[PDB]
Structures are given as C-alpha cells and as structure tokens.
Design a protein around this ligand. Structure first.
Ligand SMILES: Nc1ccn([C@@H]2O[C@H](COP(=O)(O)OP(=O)(O)OP(=O)(O)O)[C@@H](O)C2(F)F)c(=O)n1
Ligand SMILES: Nc1ccn([C@@H]2O[C@H](COP(=O)(O)OP(=O)(O)OP(=O)(O)O)[C@@H](O)C2(F)F)c(=O)n1
Ligand SMILES: Nc1ccn([C@@H]2O[C@H](COP(=O)(O)OP(=O)(O)OP(=O)(O)O)[C@@H](O)C2(F)F)c(=O)n1
Ligand SMILES: [Mg+2]
Ligand SMILES: [Mg+2]
Ligand SMILES: [Mg+2]
Lengths: 533, 533, 534
C-alpha cells in the first residue's frame, strides 16, 4: 500500500481557493472509504503564524496538539474527519530555521549548504513525515507559480515525483479564467501562460481546475487541453458558488475522483455525498431569520473571525435559522453608545488581545445582560463578561485585567503568577486540547450532554481564583473548571435566558455536518428572543 | 559626492572569474585616484565559511577584524589597497538568520514576513552599509543568473538601481563565448540567452564581459550588442591569460574605465598601471628556477592553499626566481617515506586541522632539518616543527598535541586551559590581526626590519609554555611572542640555513606589488640551496 | 504496425552536429533490420537552398528526384541506404508559401489563418507525408531551442506527440557540455538552462546527447539526469572523435538503440556494425600517403565542397591511401602563378558559378595536363578543362563560356539556346537530378564503372557547345560519355595523359564510405602511382 500524493498549485492570481478546492477533493476521496490527509506549505518567512496579527493574516487556527497554524487548516477539519497536527503545516522560515541550526551544529560535515539539495531535502522530509501512513495526501503549495517565494517548494515536489514515480503522484493546477464584458466570453490566455510558467520549472500538470465567476464551456476547456498537454477529461470547471458545501458535488459530477482513483489504481466504492447533500438542503431552506451582532476589535478584516463566523453558520443549520451576522466595532460603542446595539437578536464577543476597544466590549456584555439578550463570549468575551458582573453587580469599582491595567485594585483576570487580591495578598500560554469538567445542573451540562468535554485553548490570562468567591456570592455561576489548579473555564448568569461565556475557542471544533452544541443553543436562543418581540 | 555602485553578475556557467574581473576593474579605478571597495554576496546557506571544509570550498580567508570569509576577498586585497572587513562578504544564511531573529523577537509588529520586501530589504541594507563612504562600490553576486539561489540577490539590486537611479548604478554581466572546433568560430548564442534570462528578472545589463579561451572578434561583439540592447563599446573581451596581473591592462585598453567614469560623471586622471606593468615584467623574466614542495593534507584541492600558493609567487617576483610548486601528500610520506622529498630546493608545510597525515608532516619537518633544506611552517607547520625538535632533539618521547593525542605525556601543543607538564602539574579560537613582538638578533627581526609586526591568526591550540624551557635549552630559539600571556608565535633553528615556523597566516598579507618579507627570504634561501648542488 | 517518431533538437549552441548524430543513430537502427528514414526541418525563409550561395550554409545537396536540399541530407545517404527525396527536407519559407497559396485561393473558407493551427498543421502534414510508411522516423529540427525561428516547428512536433501518443514518440535533445580550463571540469549548467527552455515550450525531452571535447563522466551525467526529469540511463555522452564512422559504435555501447526499441516495443536482433568496423579498420591502416590539391573559389568555407572532400576520403579507403587535401585559391593562381601547384600528386577542380577565379582554374587545368599530373574536374572543372584544351591545343584564343564572356568568338560552353559558331551561325535549362549516361567503349571511365550506362546527378545550366565540339575532337580530345537525345557531352578525357577525366555531373553525391565510388577510386589510385614515380 504505497502512499499517493496530489500536489496542488495555483497560477495567474492568488485568490483561487486552493485550500477549499483541496478540502473538497479530500471530502470526496474520504467518501469512498480512503484515508486522506491534507497539508499546507506556506511561503512566508514567519516560523509560525503565532507572531502574526489577525488584522493582516487572519485567524490563527489551533490544532489538538497545540500548534498555531494557518487558517486553511480550519477548512481541512471542516471537510474531512482526519485530525490536523503540527505536521500538516510548515513555512519557509521553519525550513531555514531547521537547516541553519544543523549547519551551526555541524551536522552537514563541513559541506556547502545549498538550496539544492539541502533546502529541498528538508522540504521533502516534512512532506513525507506528515504524509506517510495514508492512502492519498494532498499537498497545497502556497503562493502563485512564477514567484520567487514558492520556487524551493516547487523544485522539491518535482524531485518527489521522480523518485516516487508518476504512478503515485499527480499535479493539480488551479488557474483563473476571467470573463470579459467586451467580448462576452471567458479568456483562457492567462491559463496558457501559467502552465508554460509551471513547465519552465520542470512540472507538467495533470489536472487543471479552472476558477471563474461562471462555468467554463467545453469549447474553452478543449482549447486549454490543447495548449497544455492535458487530456480534456482532466480539465475541471469550478465556478463561483454561494456555498462551498456544493463544491464536492460539483467536482464529483465531472469525474475528478474517478480520474484520480484510476491513476493511483484504487478500487473503492462510489462517493457517498449524502451528508453534504443534507447540509446544502438545510442551508437552502431556513424557516426563520435572526440578526446576531459580533462585537470585536479586528472587524476591519472579517477573516480574523473565520472559524467564529463559520460556527454561527453551523448553528443555523441545526436550527433551520438564517443567521445574519453583523460586524460592529467595539470602539464605536465607546464613542456612540449602546445605540448601535439595538435591534439585535443576539450578541457575541469573540477573543482578542490588547486594551484597544475593550471598554466597549465590557459595555456590550452589560447591555446584553440588562436587557435579557442572548450572549456568547469566547476567551476575551469571557473576560469582559466577568468584568461587567464584578464591576456592576459585585460592586468591584474599576475591576479590570492585568493585561490592560497592571496595577488595578480588582484584578479579576491575571496571570497565574500575578494573582493577588484587593489588598495585595498572594498565595503560598495554554495551547491545544484540554479536558474540562462541567458543573451539574448547568446550562452547558445540558447542551454537551456529557460530564467532561475537550476544547482548544489559546490564551495567557486566567480568572483570578482569589476574587472568584466574591463574584459567586453576587449571583454569578461557574460551569466549567479544569486542571489541578481548577481554573475557571465557563461562566453563566442564571437570571438570564442565555448567557454563557467560555475561555477556550469552541469555533475550532465546529463542523457543518456535526455542528457544535454551544453554537446550536446560542442560535436557538437567538430565534426565541426574536419570537418574543 | 553620491556613492556609485557596479553590480557584477555571471551567466552561462559559474567558472568565469567574477572576483578576478571585479578586482581588476577595481585596480584600474583605484589607479585613477578613486576610493574603491568590493563586496561579495554568496548564495549558500552557511552563515559563514568558518564551518566549511577546505576540501570542498577552498581556503578560509581571514580579514583584519577576524572574519572568516570567502577566498574571493583574497583576490580583492591583492588587487586594491582597501582593507576588507566583515561588511565585505555575507551569505544567504546570514540574511535569513537576521530576519528570523527579528521575527521571533517581534520587530516586524505582527506583519507577514515575506521575501519581498523583508528579505530584499535586509540585502539592500548590508550593501549600503558596506558601500557608503566610497566613490565606486563593486558588488559581486555569486551564482549563475537563472538559478533559484541568486534570485533574492538579483531582485534586491534591481530595486536599488531604481531608487539610487541609473545615473549612479551599472550592471556588468559576464558570459561565456565558447569556441567550437567544428565551425572554427566562437558562439555568442549562450550570451544571447543569458541576457534574456537576466532581463526576465528585471535587470538590463550595461556592460558585457565576454570570457573565452581567445579574444572575441569585433564581428561577434557587434552581434552581441545587437541582441542585448548594449552599445558596442560596452562589450568587452576578456580572454584566457597566463597571468591575472595582465587583466587590468587588458580592460583599460578597451576603455572599460572610461565608460564607467563617463556614466558616473567622474573626472579623474588617467589610470597609472605602472606598478602592474612592473609585476608582469618581473614574472615574465626569471633569472633562476627552484622546486619548492608543499606537504599538506588538503592537496586534493589546490584551492585549499590559495593564498599560500600566491604568496610563493610573490616571493619569486621579488627575487626574480621561477618557483615551481609541487603538491605532495603528507600521507604518502607515512607510506612511502622521505623518498618523495628528494630533489626539493625547499619544503613548506601549511596549516590545517585533524590528525590525518600529521605524522607525515612531522617526518617532513625532520627531513628538512637534518639535511639543511629551507623550511617554512604556517600554523600546523609550526606545530609539527616543534614536535620534531622536542621528539628527536629534546628526547621527549612521543611528544604530540592534545588535538591529536589528548592524553600524551609531552603535550607540547595544547589549549591554554589544557596546559600541563610531563607529570600532570598545571598553573594557578583566535581570529584576526594581532601585534607580535620579535626577538632581537633573530632571522625574522632582520627580514621584517621592525620591532613589532602585525599578522592574522586562525587557530585554537597554542604552544605549551610549561614545556618551552626544556626545548629552548635543547637549542631551539623563540623569535616571536605576543599578548599578556606571551604566547609563542615564531620559532627558529639557528644551526640551519633557513628554518622559520610561525603560528599566524602570513599568506593573507602578501601582495604581488609589495610582496611579503617572510616569503621573500624563504624563496631567496631556496635558490641559494639550489646553487650549492 | 504503427510508425514511430524520434524528434531531434539542439540546445546551447548550433554547431552540435545534429545531422551526424541523427544519421549515426539511424545506422544502428538499420543494422537491426528496421526500416528507418530521416528528414531535416530548416528554419530559414528560403523556399529551397537552391537560391543560397555555397559560402553561406555550405554545399547544395541534390537528390535523385532533382531536389536542391540542405547538406545534412548528404550525411543521411552516407549513413543509411534509404534514398532521400524532396519530402525529406523543407523550410519555413516552404510552409508559408503553401499556406499563403491556399489562403489566396480560398481553401480556408474565410477563416482567420493563424500560426496555430494553420501553420502547425502544414508542418505536421509534411512530417507525416515523408514519415508514414516506415518503422522509425528521425525528424531533425534546425536551429537552437529558444530562438524565434524554430518555435513553429517545436509547437507542431509537440502536438504530434499528443495525438500519436508517447508510446510511439521520443524527444532527443542535444546540448553542449563545455570544459573549463579555470576549474578543470565540464559544466552542466548550459544543459540545465536549455532543458528548462525546452520545457517552457511544452516539450519534455526523453534522451539527452551530451556534446563535449571529451567524455562526460558519470557524475555529470547523473547531475543532468537530476535536474531534467530524464532517467540516468537516457543521458548519452558523445565526445569529439577524429572519425565520424566511430559514432554508431559509441551510441551502441551506451545502449541508445536498446532504450529506443524498448520504448517503441520493437523486437529486433542486435545491431551488426561490421560494415562500420571495416571502414574504421581501413581508415586506420593505410599503406601509402598522397597529397591532392583542390583548387576552387569557395575554399574560405570548407563545407562548400563537403561531398567532394568526403568522396576523396572514400577513394582512399578502397586503395588504403591516406589522402591529404590541400585547399588552394584559384585567384592566387592568377596573381602568384602556378608556383603554388608544385608538390601535388593530383589536382581536383570542383564546380561553381561566376567568372571570379575561373582564369585561375583554366591555368590549373593546363598545369596538370602539360606536366602529366592526375586531374579530375566536376561541372566547372570540366568547363575549364574544355577551355584549356581549346585555347592552348586546338588554338582557339580567348575561348570561354557565355556565362563569363557572352560575346566571345569561341563559346565552347553555352546554353543550348545560345549555341553558335565562330562565324555566328546557329542550329535549326536547369538540369537537376539523376539522369542516365552512356559511356564510350575504349575510354578510361568505361573500365572504371565497368558498365555501359551509369546514373549520376546533375546541377548545372551551361552545356558543352556541340557546334564547336568536333573542332576540339580532331585536336586530340576524347569524348567518354554522352546522354539524352541531344547527345550532350558528359565526360571528356585526354588520352596523352596518365589520368585526365572531367565530368559534368556531380559524382560525389553518390559516393559512400561503405561502397566508395568507381571514379574517385581510380583518381586516388592514379595519385598514388604519381607519388611513387617522384
Ligand atoms: N503558444 C501560442 C498560443 C496562441 N497563439 C496565437 O493566439 C492567437 C489567438 O489569440 P486569442 O484569441 O486572443 O487567445 P486564445 O488562444 O483564443 O485563448 P482565449 O481567447 O480564451 O484567451 C492565435 O492566432 C494563435 F496564433 F494561436 C500563438 O501565437 N502562440
Ligand atoms: N532572438 C533570436 C536570435 C536569432 N535567431 C535566429 O538564429 C539564427 C542564427 O543562428 P546561429 O548562427 O546558430 O546563432 P548566431 O545568432 O549567429 O550567434 P552564434 O553563431 O555566435 O552562436 C537566425 O536565422 C536567426 F533567425 F536570427 C532567432 O530566431 N531568434
Ligand atoms: N535549478 C537550480 C540548479 C542549481 N542551483 C544552484 O547551483 C548551485 C551550484 O552551482 P554550479 O556548481 O555552478 O552548477 P552545477 O549544478 O553544479 O552544474 P555545473 O557545475 O556542471 O555547471 C547550487 O548551490 C544550487 F543551489 F543547486 C539553483 O539555485 N537552482
Ligand atoms: Mg479567443
Ligand atoms: Mg552564427
Ligand atoms: Mg559544480
């Protein structure tokens, strides 16, 4: 059982949806009983996206093992059931960091360390490390063919195709076929030049995925097959769609999975996309509609809350409710007031870092609590919720977090080493999955329908346990704790229809096929609030 | 006084002599009164050539400040009088090491670190750092145009030409014009394709240097000018020569310096190459001939002793003696004996590391001392000389160095921390220039004609001062000491015509125009030994 | 059985010997019992090489059917026994002329005639026309990969591989591996960049022939295989050799024919190169050595007399004589005299056109006739021999050809429509291809060919004037061969001479190293006997 590889590249432009196209193809192959995995090769010099800002890169996806990776891995876990780890995403800076250390350590034996073979061997070893043990491995190459930054990746996979052999490797190249309003037709010329650019590096593509705002006609697909040494049946058309859940069905109708199984000599049953057909039906037929407002600080780039937005979509699928997400700036709450919070069936405050716009998130958690509006807080959303309750119900004046105000009197949120009290008395970066214990007779104990749950963390500041008892007596309820130190994970307000706030990131485990219990109840409570108007 | 830059690249093949061509052009510009400097941009991932083996890379040149650089800087210091430093040579691994540390330290403010502009800006800053403050700066780009490894360098200098402006930048491209025995003509086709490859990166060359085993005719130079958008007067012919000292004269006769001074708007006097005309005359008319044998361990690549071989050439220029250097393997001395040492007018043992073939170097230093054959030892050549005298004259049985035999009874050579004696009693990496004090009435005090001298070091193991007094009483003389610890630098044997051994590397300060006092006397004593046969 | 194609291309430079390497590969395949053929695709705009000077691309080779073609076809016939014709060589101008003709008629039906597919289809139709009907077809693509002129050829052959399939197509690419004296090694970088350029057009080479002044080591051949997606066994080395007849043996030892037969699924026996080993054995074991001087007007480019030079070397094989050919300028005879013709064991005067340097050839034909030096004239070499015997023996002063002096008194050589007398009386044109010639019984050429009629190839316009011929016959000149209905003179001889033969046709176009030629064999033998008497 030799492991087969499918290398995915992109040409013409960069906004082609390589990750979505790879995840959709992997969903078809997994629907035929195959063991499939996906990996992402990023060309930036950052060692990992942990040091990158959400305003420029997007959200930082977190795997089970605790790796900060590109958000494309969120697409992978939402299309296939194979768990992603650190081996599924590495960058150019990671490769050079490995080679530089081995060179200073003297592991190359005084040899001249060069791009070929030293840099290329480092790339090929990581692809084989995260690929071996599967039937089909999809390797997404970041960047656009023809740029400097992707050449080490492209030269490395070319060498793999030669040693592994053409009988177990495929090159899938995505191109742009733009439509011109002048001639009223789509143009295949950018595709012709891109394939020539990919050939000038030594790679002959085997499958061409044509991206366009409309279906690519057979006459244009025949011309592309003529100039690119590709059979016509291997030229697939992928139009712009309103729902990425339809893409697996669109690729199967053109026989993309059949051409792959034939090349790799795989005899597997027909792809059963019945789960995806169900998701398309649920999305296309909502019975209600709600308006949930997301109050954050990174709203200038909606990709900063990628998994959060997709988690609200999955909440509406399980409840047959059309969720209309409204991005509202938390700084405008400080400027204009809670007037930009009226007319919302629910309110969600996602995570973040930095004091900019936090006082607006505290005011937003207050408006949702005084007016019985459903509220869901994630990471920073739990901090501003705990602040509001301590500052306004527990009467802890100017309660804040040490991240924002280091020398505050009431540090309800602080590092484990920074824990103190209102007088100064003391006691004698969490990443990845961690088990959590739920409190009985709580709102989250009913939803999760289980005693212990597992979620993924990405935070530094915890809830101050030396100030928790004074808030609990003020009416606040604790629903989740974890670890030997019994750190607060989930908080609730029982005198409220729906008010749950958690420290972990539940949006990293939400899928369209299986949903998520927390977002299902949050959207369900949002529609019930809309009914009572 | 804006600083002008001349970027030097190479095409077709890599063995073109880019460094020699750049050094020769810099010698012409310096002959017109201009302040010129040269820098080398290497495309390998090694942070510095310090961790590279001489068998693969060549000799490791050492500058005054103590930097381990490429051997091309040896060509630079032997053509111009501007001192080289760390700022005159950096590698791709150096650039990525800088960017990776700033990214982990958070100096990019959460931005996406990319090849452009982050990697290119790091390159442009080092070129400006080592270039500003001069009239003309020659930047040699390692590698061949069209390869992956040189693209960051080529994209970086393209951006400099745009900002600095074409009025102060030039691109000089070296190509190969091979001769075919079939058609009896030279072929310009590789040059035509190379310029197209250089244009596909965004660089339009301004001067073309045509390398060939013979002069490039005017008809071929006119065809190259036609297909490359270059004026015919800017197409220079550089044939294969028997002496690189003629290359400045060959470039001046074609007006290469005039075209550069006109572009940069420099009004300087005519190049006075009278010193180079003298060196060519001295080399072309030797009055005697000697056969000096160099006994080492890296002789399988003669470039491992690049500066040593060139230092013997400079010794013959000052004495009008034709030096015929013979590379002999020190391991063959251990196998076949001193029979491969007969018929030598002199013997030289250069530096090195490792126990392989050292016992042959000890036997060679013994054969040159018992037969009154002139001997010169550098670094390791002084260690094996001190061993022979201690092992055979001072009767220190099995005397060796701790690098080779760590637990020997007589460690005449050891680290400063490893110093001991024959019983085990103790007391209560040097790089760059260091002042040395010479002993009066010594052979080196006469040659250097000065009390204190400055030479460059590259070694770890020193002479054991606790075992030096027992060797001095055996007749051995100490000629040089340095530092507060008074480390042994130069040793001599007075009952010998010529027997000098030093710890520093004198070959790094030898030039064809000014020679070197140590190699001048060594070759002079080699001819006197030839007369007495 | 399906016809297989082997496309041959060149990179880095142009002087790689693509024709010699293709012909040598075809000789191996023919030695295995395969029906093989070759064809040359020239990228110049000339419709046919007939309108080209010999000091430009070389000699103008002539086939049996009368087609003026590139000289590479001369290498083909000297290596394989398959006869070449017009459909074995065409140019870019030939393609555009055909497409422009169909477009002016209207055969494209008001369509936009474009490089693709109209020009590319015209190329593919001609390759299939001269290719279909054989087992293996070698298509040599002229020019260097990466230039503009060869791009229509490379795109057309790329489309053929897709339609035919890779089970019957192979791409063989020749590159240059130069040796650097500065590093003492050969360089594979020009090959790497050339393959990338061939890939950017859409062609992935299958075999790489490495040309160098020495054998390419295995480490370099392994590095080339690494960067070019080519298996290491398909990287062949082809050093510079002193004798081109050794090349078939060199390609066989590296298993080039075995790799080709495996790809095309051909079951044929092992090649037998005994006929080539015999030629090498004859060439490396001479018993005598002679010096034959060739006096012409195109000596500045030795390839202008390519087939003549090779014909003299074939004559030396049949006689075990090492021939030293000395090229002499006919103009230097006009200025410096016949002083530069001393020390020659024989004199050969090839063909040509133009009055420039003809008077030096007439003087040379006189030198070899008076001093009894073996002489052989071809086309123009017969004109200057006929002029010499009429101007200096038959006493017809200022006798010349109308090509040179149109209004002369004795036009011994003129067009058939120009035939006249010394008084002006008349009687009551490009010859190309093979034509039968009848020989005279008691003649020297009759015993050499040992047959009454022969077949040789012509390329000339001016004929021997029959109206002034009988006056030269009575002067002592012998006519050895005539042809056609008009009894045009083909071969002439001088009896009072050891070996003096001149012919109108080009016998060098039928000479081969394995079979020789009867006329050149006797000429070299006569040169050996002259050297013995001195
Ligand atoms: N490698 C190539 C490819 C094409 N063409 C020339 O391209 C010309 C057609 O140009 P168009 O109509 O603008 O491009 P298209 O191919 O039709 O693809 P689309 O229209 O979807 O962008 C032919 O005359 C040609 F001649 F075919 C060329 O010269 N060289
Ligand atoms: N960009 C180009 C350049 C040239 N050529 C074509 O190249 C052809 C000449 O090819 P050669 O003689 O082998 O190369 P050379 O130019 O003479 O240089 P050298 O001989 O020193 O290598 C022209 O017909 C051409 F037509 F000029 C081309 O098609 N496209
Ligand atoms: N596609 C490529 C190929 C090579 N190189 C880089 O080319 C560099 C080696 O340079 P060289 O020695 O001059 O070329 P050679 O391959 O050895 O072939 P020859 O020497 O026979 O001409 C590597 O560091 C490299 F890194 F391998 C590159 O950057 N991109
Ligand atoms: Mg079109
Ligand atoms: Mg040419
Ligand atoms: Mg090399």
């Amino acid at each position: 059982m030799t492991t087969n590889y499918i290398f995915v590249t992109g040409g013409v432009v960069s906004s082609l949806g390589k990750g979505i196209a790879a995840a959709s193809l992997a969903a078809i192959l997994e629907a035929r009983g195959l063991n499939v995995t996906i990996m992402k090769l990023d060309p930036y010099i950052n060692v990992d996206p942990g040091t990158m800002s959400p305003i420029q890169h997007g959200e930082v996806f977190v795997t089970e093992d605790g790796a900060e990776t590109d958000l494309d891995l969120g697409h992978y876990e939402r299309f296939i059931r194979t768990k992603m780890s650190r081996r599924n995403n590495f960058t150019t800076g990671r490769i050079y960091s490995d080679v530089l250390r081995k060179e200073r350590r003297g592991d190359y034996l005084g040899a001249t360390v060069q791009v070929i073979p030293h840099i290329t061997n480092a790339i090929k070893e990581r692809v084989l490390e995260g690929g071996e043990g599967h039937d089909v491995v999809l390797v997404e190459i970041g960047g656009t063919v023809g740029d400097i930054e992707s050449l080490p990746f492209l030269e490395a996979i070319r060498q793999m195709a030669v040693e592994i052999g053409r009988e177990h490797t495929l090159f899938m190249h995505l191109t742009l076929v733009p439509y011109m309003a002048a001639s009223g037709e789509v143009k295949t010329k950018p595709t012709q030049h891109s394939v020539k650019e990919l050939l000038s590096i030594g790679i002959q593509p085997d499958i061409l995925i044509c991206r366009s705002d409309r279906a690519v006609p057979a006459n244009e697909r025949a011309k592309i097959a003529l100039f690119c040494n590709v059979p016509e049946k291997a030229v697939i058309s992928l139009k712009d769609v309103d729902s990425i859940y339809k893409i697996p069905g669109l690729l199967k109708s053109q026989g993309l999975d059949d051409y792959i199984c034939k090349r790799f000599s795989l005899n597997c049953p027909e792809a059963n996309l019945s789960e995806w057909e169900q998701v398309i039906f649920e999305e296309a037929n909502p019975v209600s509609e709600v308006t949930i407002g997301m109050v954050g600080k990174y709203i200038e780039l909606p990709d900063a809350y990628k998994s959060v937005i997709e988690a609200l979509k999955h909440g509406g699928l399980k409840n047959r409710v059309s969720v209309n997400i409204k991005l509202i700036d938390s700084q405008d709450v400080e400027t204009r007031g809670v007037e930009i919070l009226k007319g919302l069936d629910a309110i969600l405050v996602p995570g973040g870092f930095g004091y900019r716009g936090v006082e607006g998130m505290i005011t937003t958690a207050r408006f949702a609590r005084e007016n019985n509006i459903p509220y869901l807080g994630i990471c920073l959303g739990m901090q501003v919720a705990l602040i509001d309750y301590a500052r306004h119900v527990a009467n802890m004046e100017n309660a804040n977090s040490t991240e924002f105000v280091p020398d505050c009197k009431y540090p309800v949120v602080a590092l484990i080493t920074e824990w103190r009290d209102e007088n100064g008395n003391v006691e004698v970066m969490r990443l990845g999955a961690q088990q959590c214990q739920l409190v009985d007779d709580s709102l989250v104990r009913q939803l999760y329908n289980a005693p212990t749950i597992v979620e993924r963390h990405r935070h530094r500041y915890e809830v101050n346990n030396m100030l928790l008892k004074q808030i609990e007596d003020a009416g606040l309820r604790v629903a989740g704790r974890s670890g030997d130190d019994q750190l607060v994970e989930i908080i609730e307000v029982p005198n409220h229809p729906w008010f749950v706030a958690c420290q972990f990131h539940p949006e990293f485990t939400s899928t369209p096929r299986d949903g998520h219990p927390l977002f299902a109840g949050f959207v369900k409570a949002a529609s019930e609030f809309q009914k009572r108007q």
